[PDB]
Amino acid sequence: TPHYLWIGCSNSRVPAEKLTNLEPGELFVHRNVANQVIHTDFNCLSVVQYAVDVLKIEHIIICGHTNCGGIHAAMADKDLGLINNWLLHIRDIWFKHGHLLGKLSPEKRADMLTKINVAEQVYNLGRTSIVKSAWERGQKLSLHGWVYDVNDGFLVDQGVMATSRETLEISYRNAIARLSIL
Template identity: 30%
Template sequence: MSDLDTLLNGLFTANAQWAKDVEAAEPGFFQESVKGQAPHTLWIGCADSRVPESVVLGARPGDVFVHRNIANQFPLDDVNSKAVLEYAVNFLGVQHGAFPVVVVHFIFPTYSLPVVVVGHTECGGATACLAAAKRTTFPEHGQLLTIPTLPYEAPLNQWLEPLTRLAGTLDLSTTPMEEALPVVVEENVKLQVENLSKTTTLANAWASNDNRRNVRVHGWVYNLNTGLLKDLQVTKGAST
């Protein structure tokens, strides 16, 4: 048996044990989950494997609706990100401040949700963008290569370009990396909160006469050294 086969078999074994443990602790949990999901939070986070949202929040399957990508970005021209937001706000029935047990799909929900944008310390995407912004050859205009070993058209360079340009505006060229990186991480979270607040989905929600008006967007940072979340106090809502 190859090392890959051993790894894959181990994953199935771990899954079987997990399912057994969950059923033993809460009989009928999986049968109940078939009836629908009732998440209380929309988490927009980084794809980094060290920041698994359900583990970080001590949550169960069904508690958190999730959208993750490299460096927890929410580009206004990204249909994937916008579709997740639209579904969560308008159809899913996640909420802000309470925990529902019933979800009715494809009608406006009777409650609203916290949307949390979560960056994290030691983010690899933010590190690459900061390093690119600190190069003496950083271009103010034109093509920008965050990963110089890849062509401009490479998906990774295309995805990271907005964050690299953000890092280039922060006047960090002479700041040591260990001091500059937390600034980039936090400023990136703040920008994504702003981007979310500019979406048609949230504009319509905040202008509505139903509970979607109560949707709030929060900006957090997860600290890999402590396992704790930090609230950046940049919350956006209908009145902010």
Template identity: 40%
Template sequence: MNSLSLLVCALLQLHAVWGLAPLQWPASRGPELLSTKAADVGIVRGDPVLQGLLANNTAWAAGVEKEHPGFFNKSAQGQHPPVLWIGCSDSRVPESVITNVLPGEIFTQRNIANQIPSNDTNVVAVISYAVEHLEVDRIVVAGHTHCGGVEYCYDHAAALPSPPPKPLPPLPEPILNAWLESLYATAVQMLQGGKPPSRDQGLADLTLANVRIQVGNVAGLDVVKHAWKEGRNLTIVGWLYEIEHGLLKDLSICIGPFGRNCTIGAY
């Protein structure tokens, strides 16, 4: 059952529990209430930002269909992306835009500072689905410059005395501390090894270290090790998106079958 069907069922159950009148579907459309036409979505009227997004989508869809006739009908038949992209939630790093590909080419997991904790159900579920069901053979871990999560951890680590107290004081926001605890610890460890000549250099070093660590975290997941055991040529690479230039940079971080280092041309 898809998410829309689950939502409809939940609404029907709530109406029954609360004794409300039955839901009435428009006779012309049946239960397909979610229209793709911007004019039918009255809730956004008066909001120029949301209206603009819907208008842009209409123009984009028309342009894609004109350039690639039948694209959306074909897309509805299923997805076979060759790449899983694990990146940051930052609005300036939309993977399909910066790589100039159409929908269906990249399966995606994005979160603050492109973290890959092995105990996070959401992250592991995405990777498992990509590897086991979509059978992707390329996983890209993409960090980026000017990452808010990296800056947050670095600045709080830099403010600690040397040597830092044990245990480390948590980051101010509890939810961010829970998510970025590992990156924060990496920043503290890095700074205790010697302060960089500048904040910019420190941020660059932490960004690179973060990508390297997350590539290793992917390689350590059971689903990835199982794929290698089955003979899959699954490759994990680390990239960096330079926001100030709009360019992706190959960091020469690459792990192939059974955790072996590999060259970028291997896949």
């Protein structure tokens, strides 16, 4: 069996199976643009459901990365057609935390939003009924939010790690709090 679901970015500089030292065929993988878990996305949420319910996976890892073309385009003011719609979700976050990112130099900004994004996505994953109910029936399931420093090797980027719904709150809220005061 696989023991982890890996939700990562479609981008190539992020190879899930290679960068970790984990055994081959242990990762059940979903990748989309800027690693998103949108409330109304049947594509991602099907993988999560197949993972949790069918494969009884005990760990979902969400994982962003620095220099993500996703995050950059999300902040660019440029019509690239259909991706612009998908990235508007990321922009909602950008402006949700706009005061933080406002302060930052216009490049720390890119990587900060990258970190914030993962937190927010773990937060979406955690409010999923797929996940929520797995918890409620006593299933062991932990969520995780990391960022792969593409020029280095990754950080358990955040204390954004839930094993229940309340631990989701503690984690996320602390995550956001911390990153809005260094």
